[PDB]
Coordinates of C-alpha atoms in Angstrom, one line a residue:
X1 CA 93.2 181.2 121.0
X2 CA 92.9 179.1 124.3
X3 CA 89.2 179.1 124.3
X4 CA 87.2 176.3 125.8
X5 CA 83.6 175.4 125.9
X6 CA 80.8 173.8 126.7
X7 CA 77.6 174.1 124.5
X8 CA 74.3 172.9 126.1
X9 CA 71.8 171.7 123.5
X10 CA 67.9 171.7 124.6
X11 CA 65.8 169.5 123.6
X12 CA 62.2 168.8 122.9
X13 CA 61.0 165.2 122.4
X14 CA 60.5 162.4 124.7
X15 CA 62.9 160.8 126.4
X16 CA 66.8 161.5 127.0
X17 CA 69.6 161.2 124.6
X18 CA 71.6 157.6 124.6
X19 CA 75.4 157.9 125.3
X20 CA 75.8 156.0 122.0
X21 CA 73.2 157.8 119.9
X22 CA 74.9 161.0 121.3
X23 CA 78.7 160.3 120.6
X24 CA 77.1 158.9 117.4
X25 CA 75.8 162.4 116.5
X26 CA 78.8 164.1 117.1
X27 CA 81.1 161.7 115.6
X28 CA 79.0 162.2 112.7
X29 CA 79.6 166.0 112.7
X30 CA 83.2 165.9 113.7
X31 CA 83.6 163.1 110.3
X32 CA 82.2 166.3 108.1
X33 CA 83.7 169.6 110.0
X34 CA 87.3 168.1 111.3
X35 CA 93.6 162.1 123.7
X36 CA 89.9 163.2 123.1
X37 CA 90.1 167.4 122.6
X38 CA 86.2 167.0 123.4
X39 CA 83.7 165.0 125.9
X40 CA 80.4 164.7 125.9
X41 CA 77.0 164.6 128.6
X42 CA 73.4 164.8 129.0
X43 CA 70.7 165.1 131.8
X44 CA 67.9 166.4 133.1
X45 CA 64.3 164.7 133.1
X46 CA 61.3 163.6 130.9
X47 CA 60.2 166.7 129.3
X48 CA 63.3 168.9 129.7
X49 CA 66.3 167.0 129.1
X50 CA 69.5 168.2 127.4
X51 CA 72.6 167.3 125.8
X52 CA 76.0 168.6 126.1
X53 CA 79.0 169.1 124.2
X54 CA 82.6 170.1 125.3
X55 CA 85.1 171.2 123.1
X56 CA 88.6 171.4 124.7
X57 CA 90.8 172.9 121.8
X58 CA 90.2 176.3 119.9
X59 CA 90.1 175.4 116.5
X60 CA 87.4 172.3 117.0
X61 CA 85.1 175.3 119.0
X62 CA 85.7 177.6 115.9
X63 CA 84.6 174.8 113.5
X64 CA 82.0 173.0 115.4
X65 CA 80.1 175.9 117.5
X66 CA 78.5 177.1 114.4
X67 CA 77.7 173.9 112.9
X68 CA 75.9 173.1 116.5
X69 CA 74.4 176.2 116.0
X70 CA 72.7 175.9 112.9
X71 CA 71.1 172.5 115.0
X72 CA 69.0 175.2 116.2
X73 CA 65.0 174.4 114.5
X74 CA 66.3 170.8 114.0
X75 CA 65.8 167.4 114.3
X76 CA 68.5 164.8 115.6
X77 CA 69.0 161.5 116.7
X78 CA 70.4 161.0 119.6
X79 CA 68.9 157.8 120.8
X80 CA 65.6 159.2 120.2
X81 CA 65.0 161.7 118.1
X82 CA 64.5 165.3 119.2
X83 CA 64.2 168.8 118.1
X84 CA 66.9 170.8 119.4
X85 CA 64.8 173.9 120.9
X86 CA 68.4 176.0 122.1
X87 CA 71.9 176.1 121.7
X88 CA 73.5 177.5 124.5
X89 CA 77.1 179.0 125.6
X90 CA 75.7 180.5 128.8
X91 CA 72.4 180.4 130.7
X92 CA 72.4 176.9 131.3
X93 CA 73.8 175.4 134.6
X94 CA 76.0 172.9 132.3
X95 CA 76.9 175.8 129.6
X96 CA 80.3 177.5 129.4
X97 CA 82.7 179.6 127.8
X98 CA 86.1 180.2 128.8
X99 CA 89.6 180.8 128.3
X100 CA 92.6 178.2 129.6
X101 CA 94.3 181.6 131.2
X102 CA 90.9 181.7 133.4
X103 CA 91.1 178.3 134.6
X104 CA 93.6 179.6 136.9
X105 CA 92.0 182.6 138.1
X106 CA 92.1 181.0 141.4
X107 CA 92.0 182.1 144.5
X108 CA 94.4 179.1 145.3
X109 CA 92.9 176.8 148.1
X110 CA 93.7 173.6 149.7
X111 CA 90.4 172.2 149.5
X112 CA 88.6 171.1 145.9
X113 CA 84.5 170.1 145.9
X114 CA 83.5 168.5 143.2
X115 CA 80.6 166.9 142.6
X116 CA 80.4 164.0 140.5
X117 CA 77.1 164.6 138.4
X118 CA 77.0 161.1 136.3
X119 CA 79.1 158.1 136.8
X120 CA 82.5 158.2 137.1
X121 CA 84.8 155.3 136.9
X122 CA 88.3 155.0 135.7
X123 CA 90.7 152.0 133.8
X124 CA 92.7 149.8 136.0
X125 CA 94.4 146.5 134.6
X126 CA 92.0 145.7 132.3
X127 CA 88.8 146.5 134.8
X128 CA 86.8 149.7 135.5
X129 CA 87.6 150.8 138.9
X130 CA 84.3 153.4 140.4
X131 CA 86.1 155.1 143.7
X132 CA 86.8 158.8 143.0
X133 CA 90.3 158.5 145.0
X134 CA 92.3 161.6 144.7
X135 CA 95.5 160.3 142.5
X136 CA 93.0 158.8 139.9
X137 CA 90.4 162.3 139.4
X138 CA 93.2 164.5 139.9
X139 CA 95.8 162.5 137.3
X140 CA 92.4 162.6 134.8
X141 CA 92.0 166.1 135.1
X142 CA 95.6 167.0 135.1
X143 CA 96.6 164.5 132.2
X144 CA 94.0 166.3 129.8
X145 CA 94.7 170.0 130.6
X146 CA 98.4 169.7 130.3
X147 CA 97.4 167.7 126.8
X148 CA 95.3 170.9 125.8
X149 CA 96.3 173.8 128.0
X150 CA 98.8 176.3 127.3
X151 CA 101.3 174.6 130.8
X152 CA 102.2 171.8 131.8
X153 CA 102.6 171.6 135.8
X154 CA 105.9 171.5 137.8
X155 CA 106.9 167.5 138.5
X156 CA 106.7 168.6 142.1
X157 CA 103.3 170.1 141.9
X158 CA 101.8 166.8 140.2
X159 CA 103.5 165.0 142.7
X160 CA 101.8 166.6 145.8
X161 CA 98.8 166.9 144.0
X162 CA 99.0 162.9 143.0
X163 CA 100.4 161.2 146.4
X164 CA 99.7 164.1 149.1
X165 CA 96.1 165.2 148.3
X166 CA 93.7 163.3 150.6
X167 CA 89.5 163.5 151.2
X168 CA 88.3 164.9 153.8
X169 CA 84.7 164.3 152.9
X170 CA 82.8 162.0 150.8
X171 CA 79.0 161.0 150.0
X172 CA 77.4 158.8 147.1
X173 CA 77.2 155.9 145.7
X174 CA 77.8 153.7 142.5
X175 CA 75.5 153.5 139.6
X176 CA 75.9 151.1 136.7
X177 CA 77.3 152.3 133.3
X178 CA 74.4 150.3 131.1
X179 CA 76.8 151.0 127.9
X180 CA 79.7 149.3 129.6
X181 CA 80.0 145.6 131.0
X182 CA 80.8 145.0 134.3
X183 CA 80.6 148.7 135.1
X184 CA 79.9 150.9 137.9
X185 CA 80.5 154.5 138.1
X186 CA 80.5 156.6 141.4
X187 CA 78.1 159.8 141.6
X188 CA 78.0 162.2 144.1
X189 CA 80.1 164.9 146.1
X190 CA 83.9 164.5 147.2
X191 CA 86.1 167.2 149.2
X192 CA 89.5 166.8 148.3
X193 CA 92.1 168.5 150.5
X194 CA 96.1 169.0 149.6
X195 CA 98.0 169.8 153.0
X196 CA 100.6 172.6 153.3
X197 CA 99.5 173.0 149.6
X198 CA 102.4 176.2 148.5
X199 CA 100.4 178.6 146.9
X200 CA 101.5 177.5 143.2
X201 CA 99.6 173.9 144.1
X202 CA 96.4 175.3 145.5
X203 CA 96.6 177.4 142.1
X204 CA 97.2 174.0 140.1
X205 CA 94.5 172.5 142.2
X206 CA 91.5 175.3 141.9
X207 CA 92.9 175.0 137.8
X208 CA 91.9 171.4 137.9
X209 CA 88.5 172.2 139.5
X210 CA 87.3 174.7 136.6
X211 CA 88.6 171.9 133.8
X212 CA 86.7 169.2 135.4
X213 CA 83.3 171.4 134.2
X214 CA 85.0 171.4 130.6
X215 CA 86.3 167.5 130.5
X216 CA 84.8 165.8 132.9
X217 CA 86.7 162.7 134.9
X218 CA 88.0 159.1 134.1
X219 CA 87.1 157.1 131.6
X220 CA 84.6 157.3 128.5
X221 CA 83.6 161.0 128.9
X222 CA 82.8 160.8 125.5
X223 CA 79.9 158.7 126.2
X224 CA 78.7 161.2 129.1
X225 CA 80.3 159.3 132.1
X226 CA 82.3 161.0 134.1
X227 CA 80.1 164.7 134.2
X228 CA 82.0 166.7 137.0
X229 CA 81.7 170.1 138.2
X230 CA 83.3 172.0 141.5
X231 CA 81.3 173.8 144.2
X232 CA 82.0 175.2 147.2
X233 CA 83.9 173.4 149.9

């Protein structure tokens, strides 16, 4: 099966879920039920906030969704502790159920939006690095799906999509990653643009822009960093 997913969890209580309390949680059902096949978010606001859980690889969905599932009624830590009110595969702006064939359903184009929803940083040398350039999301995105996709992309293709994509447009700013020291991560909306892209590297490229929903970008998307999704150019 090349299923992917991303389950939204809803949850009543006050507060928002902690990026430790939240890996915490999972870790603590992955220990029981089974490069990171998973990553992990949260958002929203006092009073409607939510948690999210991404599971890259078929058999971890088939033995985790239903234990997620059965959260439904429940309560959790997560940080605080909350009831979980909903868990949902759809119906949620950050839910999602897919297949690795669909990632590249295309159409192919030379431009990728994405919008960079929590903070976003990356490892250089030894140091955290918060500007989205194109080599660094694209190489995150590209290094996980060919580590849990089906195909793995032409040397070519990685190399215009690494060295020739450029940005056309950005707009955000740095926030600090309170788990992390010394930290920043960037939030907010990049266009990315590959020129004379061949049709086989707009595919690759559009492919990388679905994944991003399921695996966010950089480092420590298990802690919730790093929560990505692409919109319209």
């Amino acid at each position: 099966s090349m299923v992917l997913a991303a389950l939204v969890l809803v949850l009543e209580g006050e507060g928002l879920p902690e990026p430790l309390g939240l890996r915490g949680f999972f870790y603590g059902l992955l220990r029981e039920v089974a490069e990171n096949p998973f990553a992990l978010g949260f958002g929203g606001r006092e009073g409607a906030a939510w948690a999210r859980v991404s599971l890259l690889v078929e058999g971890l969905y088939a033995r985790l969704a239903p234990r997620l599932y059965a959260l439904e009624g429940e309560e959790v830590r997560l940080g605080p502790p909350f009831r979980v009110r909903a868990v949902l595969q759809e119906g949620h702006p950050w839910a999602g159920v897919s297949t690795y064939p669909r990632l590249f359903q295309g159409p192919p184009s030379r431009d990728l939006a994405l919008r960079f929803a929590s903070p976003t940083f990356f490892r250089r040398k030894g140091v955290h690095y918060p500007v989205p350039e194109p080599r660094l999301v694209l190489e995150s995105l590209l290094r996980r799906l060919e580590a849990f996709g089906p195909l793995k992309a032409p040397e070519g293709v990685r190399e215009a999509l690494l060295e020739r994509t450029t940005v056309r447009s950005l707009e955000g700013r740095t926030l600090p990653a309170r788990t992390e020291v010394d930290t920043a991560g960037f939030v907010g909306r990049v266009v990315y643009h590959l020129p004379r892209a061949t049709e086989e590297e707009a595919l690759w490229l559009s492919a990388l822009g679905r994944f991003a929903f399921y695996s966010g970008v950089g480092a420590k998307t298990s802690l919730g960093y790093g929560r990505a999704r692409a919109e319209s150019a």
